[PDB]
Write a protein that binds this ligand. Structure first.
Ligand SMILES: Cc1c(CN2CCN(C(=O)C3CCCC3)[C@@H](C)C2)cc(F)cc1NC(=O)c1cccc(C#N)c1
Ligand SMILES: O=C(O)c1ccc(-c2nn(C(=O)c3c(Cl)cccc3C(F)(F)F)c3cccc(F)c23)c(F)c1
Length: 248
């Protein structure tokens, strides 16, 4: 809801609702990603990935990213007020924000102890993705996940943070900007309430600087678009109007 004078009841139900939506749209539970940290690709398995073609690695990565986006879109549609927005406004928020949320969620699958990430059943370093020839971009994604891992987000914290990545009234092309401002205001009030209540306000000053996530997402999506133009993946679109905006 967008209503003014959001009560303590509304705010705490917004926290619970967003956290449930987050937990139920994760590909794997946090406890399963943590329990798989000891399951690491052997040097033989890493060499097998490195000897794959650029196009086979592109297909594997693109497949995972398509699924990650689709989960974020499920998450967005569960956020209160989102499905009451116009289709234009839903697509404006997702086109910018969906990959930004995917990039934030990646930190759950990042192990800062040995700089590995979960990929197709085991953990491996960035040398696993050598065949793609995107060493600088993948290095920036690892760095960003490392910076987010240092915050030690609770499930509530990462849920509210990613809800605010999506429900942002400053995306160009919104026709109901005032309505999204009111939704965002209430999410910010919930986020700040929750952080104050749990004595975790110290994380606010440590969140990624204004524009860093947007910039990383821009570099990432630019690269994905170039790969798609040169070797298009065939996606069965779960959300055809959104798909048309990104793949046309
Ligand atoms: C794989 C992974 C990377 C590295 N990876 C390199 C290739 N990529 C590109 O975009 C390439 C660069 C442009 C062309 C393709 C991304 C997929 C990122 C970093 C990271 F921080 C976390 C992850 N893993 C997950 O997040 C994950 C995987 C499976 C299940 C779950 C869950 N639940 C999470
Ligand atoms: O209807 C669907 O099921 C659907 C699934 C994924 C997206 C999607 N893709 N995407 C890519 O960057 C991407 C991916 Cl994940 C893989 C290969 C090629 C691409 C390309 F770069 F071409 F868009 C996005 C970026 C931002 C916001 C998005 F919503 C997407 C989409 F728009 C719709």
């Amino acid at each position: 809801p967008e209503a003014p004078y959001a009560s303590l009841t509304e705010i705490e139900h917004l926290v619970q609702s967003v956290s449930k939506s987050y937990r139920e749209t994760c590909q794997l539970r946090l406890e399963d990603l943590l329990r798989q940290r000891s399951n690491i690709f052997s040097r033989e398995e890493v060499t097998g990935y490195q000897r794959k073609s650029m196009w086979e690695m592109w297909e594997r990565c693109a497949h995972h990213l398509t699924e990650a986006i689709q989960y974020v879109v499920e998450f967005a549609k569960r956020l209160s007020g989102f499905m009451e927005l116009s289709q234009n406004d839903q697509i404006v928020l997702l086109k910018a924000g969906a990959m930004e949320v995917v990039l934030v969620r990646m930190c759950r699958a990042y192990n800062a102890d040995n700089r590995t990430v979960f990929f197709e059943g085991k953990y491996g370093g960035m040398e696993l993705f050598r065949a793609l020839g995107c060493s600088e971009l993948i290095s920036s994604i690892f760095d960003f996940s490392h910076s987010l891992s240092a915050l030690h987000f609770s499930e509530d914290e990462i849920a509210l943070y990613t809800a605010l990545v999506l429900i942002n009234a400053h995306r160009p092309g919104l026709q109901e900007k005032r309505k999204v401002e009111q939704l965002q205001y209430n999410l910010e009030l919930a986020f700040h309430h929750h952080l104050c209540k749990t004595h975790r306000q110290s994380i606010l000053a440590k969140l990624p600087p204004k524009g860093k996530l947007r910039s990383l997402c821009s570099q990432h999506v630019e690269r994905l678009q170039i790969f798609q133009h040169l070797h298009p993946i065939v996606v069965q679109a779960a959300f055809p109007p959104l798909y048309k905006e990104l793949f046309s």
